Amino acid sequence: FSCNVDGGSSIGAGTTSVYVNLDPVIQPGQNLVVDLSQHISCWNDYGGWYDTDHINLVQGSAFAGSLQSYKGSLYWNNVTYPFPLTTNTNVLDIGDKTPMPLPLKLYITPVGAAGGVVIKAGEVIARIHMYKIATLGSGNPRNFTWNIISNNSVVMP
Ligand SMILES: OC[C@H]1O[C@@H](Oc2cccc3cccnc23)[C@H](O)[C@@H](O)[C@H]1O
Structure with missing residues (x-):
């Protein structure tokens, strides 16, 4: 089983x-x-549904210390979970060698955020364990x- 990010090495x-672009405001x-x-x-590194891979996201996946006051949801593979994750998600099965983009979205509601820059470019915003x-x-x-990691500043007025 292998993955890549932005089409990079396995x-x-x-x-x-x-690295992700975020709404700058x-x-x-x-x-x-x-x-x-x-x-x-x-x-799947063989393809053909031979030795099928079973993937889930893991309890404890969360925002990163600076943003732990934040609220969120995590969409994974047909289910939207509260985030940070308090349980393991459903399993996605991977059997084709053709890459599958992960069906994974994070929704972030800043909580207790003060004005000005709330997320820095280069800042780890969340750690997702798979x-x-x-x-x-x-x-x-x-x-x-x-x-x-955010590619850009996010500011709140
Ligand atoms: O994805 C199907 C299987 O791939 C196996 O790993 C590989 C198989 C064949 C070629 C590979 C090339 C690079 C990395 N790995 C490869 C894993 O050892 C198995 O556990 C299962 O994940």
């Missing part, structure tokens, strides 16, 4: 930065939508973390 485990009452399907794709286990043998389980 990743089999570990932590990877995922956020009004109170509004949320930020982060569509991670635009960045992260994964695939778990993989396949079908044959032990399943060769692997952990991924997606460190979601």
Whole structure:
């Protein structure tokens, strides 16, 4: 099982930065939508539904310390969960070698945010843990973390 970010080199485990554009201005009452399907794709390394991969997101995935007061939702594979995640998500099954963009969106509601710059460019905004286990043998389980990083400032007036 492998993934990539923005069409880059293959990743089999570990932590990877995922850079995203955010609305540069956020009004109170509004949320930020982060569509991670635009960045992260994964695939089965054999294809043909031979040793199918089973992927889910993991309890504990959260905003990153500075933004832990924030509220959110996490859409994954037909279900929208409260974020930070308090349980493991449903399983997505990956059997084709053709990359599948992850069906993954984060909705962010800044809470307790003070005026001016609320998110910095280069700031890790959320850490999403993803778990993989396949079908044959032990399943060769692997952990991924997606460190979601803003490409730009976000300001609130
Ligand atoms: O995705 C289908 C399977 O891929 C297996 O890994 C690979 C198989 C074949 C070629 C690969 C090339 C690079 C990385 N891995 C590869 C995993 O060992 C198994 O656990 C399951 O994930």
